[PDB]
Amino acid sequence: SRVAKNPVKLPAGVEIKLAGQQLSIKGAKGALELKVHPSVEVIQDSGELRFAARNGDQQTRAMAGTTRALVNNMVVGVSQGFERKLQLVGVGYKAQAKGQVLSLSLGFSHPVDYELPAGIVAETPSQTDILIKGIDKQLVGQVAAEIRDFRPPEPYKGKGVRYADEVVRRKEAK
Amino acid sequence: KTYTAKPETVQRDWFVVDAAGQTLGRLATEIARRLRGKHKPEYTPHVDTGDYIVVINAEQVRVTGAKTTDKMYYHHSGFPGGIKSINFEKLIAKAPERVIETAVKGMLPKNPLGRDMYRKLKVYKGASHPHTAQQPQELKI
Amino acid sequence: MKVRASVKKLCRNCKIIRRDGIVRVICSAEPRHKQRQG
């Protein structure tokens, strides 16, 4: 496991309250808790964390890599924040955010009002550009997925909510 | 010549078993064998010489493998197409005592004596039971 | 999705994946290459 053998470098300003398996990490943006799997060696020696497997079965070998990946996502989270860019394509497709409610205009006969959960903030620098911000990578990806779920991109004009780096497959009528 | 247990002079004890963390079938065999009196030298096949078993923490019984979602309890209502099925997991959430009760009932004889032995099994959902006046002795298998 | 007894990679971008005990082929290039249950 090249991932579990790669230690996660703790930056400046991250505290830990490692108690048994309930790891916790704080930062300038928030605090997150992780219940580490009871088969993964997690310990702290310096401003750095490394992960090992208590028993080399196979599930624990994968568990160590996934725990290392999760903790790194935690460390990057509380220190920098995670973001997902969403673009809106199509005439009359507008998105506007008012606090904890995102209002989408996606060619429907009703108003699309999405309630962002706690810890997630959405900004719309343009009427056709969404910006989900948060400290938990899973929640940021989850929220961005449901917003794109309202109108996924179509292959004939690209219209619909899409990720900024998403390669929207395109085609045309023969 | 061979001894037989008279129903009038059967000594019956009360035991409480904690089902928390126990495998359903392996706990049900001990319960079924102690409801039969097979642990007693006075065992008679036509006499209920067994003890009373109180089971607590019934929802905390466990099944190995993928049996939590895969073990299915079927019954028929007598009406055409009346076959009904429930999960182990959803039966535990709905009628947790029925899970232990079903596993013991299939392990008892299917006759009047087996229904008599079933009447000595008391299964409860909480960590407490109403039979404190009988002072059950804890029986950890 | 194409559901057949014999699923296999139809191109380089096709990937063999097991999900919940089902052998699946997903393709990042062609949605037409999606297969199931091999």
Partner: protein, 59 residues
Amino acid sequence: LWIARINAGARQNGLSYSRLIAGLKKAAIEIDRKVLADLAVNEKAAFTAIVEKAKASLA
């Protein structure tokens, strides 16, 4: 019926039926199961002495 009662009586003494019968052959005890089942119910001290004699013979 005798074997079941001997099993119940011997398990109260730390032995299964199969281990007790093997022990009762290692130590040459020819008490049959009808009498053994009568001891296990009516003469429990006598039955305990026999079980201990089988346990010693096994090991």
